[PDB]
């Protein structure tokens, strides 16, 4: 048996910050469909009439943590701090976005400062781009020379998840399944 390792993705103990989102290739395996226990489940571009010769190819599973009210940004055609500077889906996205509340895993009563998102960036991400720079951001004319200070900012900001945050501000774990839908015999 070589069942596809989705359990490794959805059930991972730790999730990445969204600026450093993880990508898992799903390949050379047989998928165990196993399904509405999820607060978001949305698919895009999956438009097939014939269902008998369906083949999923180029399957990637991306995963990360964002705020409940940011999950709306993980969709084609959206804007915001997450879609502009952290995780960008393309207009023609084909695949599904899956999310669930993880307040009891990813919040801490003192505030969890381990989860971050990129706050400063001079231009938008391209689709499926991952920016992990920690270069000090130059918000002025004077160079920073890697020293923080006025107009010289660490580009990442903490979410500070706390269990008493409003539900829209609580951490959500997100899995983005992207693929191409081809028509082919097995």
């Amino acid at each position, epitope marked *: 048996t070589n069942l596809c390792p989705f359990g490794e993705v959805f059930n991972a103990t730790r999730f990445a910050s969204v600026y450093a989102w993880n990508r898992k290739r799903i390949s050379n395996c047989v998928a165990d469909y196993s399904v509405a226990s999820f607060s978001t489940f949305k698919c895009y571009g999956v438009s097939p009439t014939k269902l008998n010769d369906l083949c999923f190819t180029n399957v990637y599973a991306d995963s990360f943590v964002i705020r409940g009210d940011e999950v709306r940004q993980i969709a084609p055609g959206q804007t*915001g701090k997450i879609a502009d500077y952290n995780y960008k889906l393309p207009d023609d996205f084909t695949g599904c976005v899956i999310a669930w509340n993880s307040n009891n895993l990813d919040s801490k009563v003192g505030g969890n400062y381990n989860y971050l998102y990129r706050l*400063f960036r*001079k*231009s938008n991400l391209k689709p499926f781009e991952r920016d992990i720079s920690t270069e000090i951001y130059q918000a002025g004319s004077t160079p920073c020379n890697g020293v923080e200070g006025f107009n010289c900012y660490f580009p990442l900001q903490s979410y500070g*998840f706390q269990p*008493t*945050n409003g539900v*829209g501000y609580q951490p959500y774990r997100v899995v983005v399944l992207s693929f191409e839908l081809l028509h082919a015999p097995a």
Partner: antibody
């Protein structure tokens, strides 16, 4: 010397247009989040709009479709285009360099907008 | 919609007194909240962000804290230069934008 200087306010009839300017010195407008905040006379602060470092723009519901925020790199200036003005847009309009979770740290002195017949 | 209700609305207090302004959120918000001081005829001045972090240059007698829906700003020993209206501010995630409290006017007793 870090400052914001607003201009462009004045008396305008209902339905008219106004364009506010915020000339920055001491930081690069095109690299920052910038917000417009207004204060009707004897009232509190109301947030109007902001533009992100990378260009996305957002608006309070009360000005949706009538106002437009923008900026000019070469003049280091922020703008607020205001159309179809109504009496309740009457306020002092402040521009501010926006650091999001770290607050609005630099403010202009304000420009006064009076909408009246 | 999310509302920030400050209390008290107004307050008179003597020099040297301890002043505490509350901001209550009508619903759960984030861990981050900012506080501004507006003197009459002047632009607001940033005092605290991230609920408790002092803005550079602000005197140590200012402090902030809070959790859940109830946040506070505190002046440990009122100096005379501390008259103003005080506003709390939350950066909302959707729709992106800011909510302000209605403000608290603090005057000096003499």
């Amino acid at each position: 010397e870090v400052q914001l200087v607003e201009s462009g306010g004045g008396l305008i009839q209902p339905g008219g247009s106004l364009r506010l300017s915020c000339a920055a010195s001491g930081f690069t407008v095109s690299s920052n989040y910038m917000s417009w905040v207004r204060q009707a006379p004897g009232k509190g602060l109301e947030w109007v709009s902001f533009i992100y470092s990378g260009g996305s723009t957002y608006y309070a519901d009360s000005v949706k479709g009538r106002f437009t925020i923008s900026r000019d790199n070469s003049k280091n200036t922020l703008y607020l285009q205001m159309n179809s003005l109504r009496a309740e847009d009457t306020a002092v309009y402040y521009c501010a360099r926006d650091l999001q979770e770290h607050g609005m740290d630099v403010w202009g002195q304000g420009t006064t907008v009076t909408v009246s017949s | 919609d999310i509302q920030l209700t400050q209390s008290p609305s107004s307050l008179s207090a003597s020099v040297g007194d301890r002043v505490t302004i509350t901001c209550r959120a009508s619903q759960g918000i984030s861990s981050y909240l900012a506080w501004y001081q507006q003197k009459p005829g002047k632009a607001p001045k940033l005092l605290i962000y991230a609920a408790s972090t002092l803005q550079s240059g602000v005197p140590s007698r200012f402090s902030g804290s809070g959790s859940g829906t109830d946040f506070t700003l505190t002046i440990s020993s009122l100096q005379p230069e501390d008259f103003a209206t005080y506003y709390c501010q939350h950066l909302n995630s959707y729709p992106p934008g800011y909510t302000f409290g209605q403000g608290t006017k603090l005057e000096i007793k003499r």
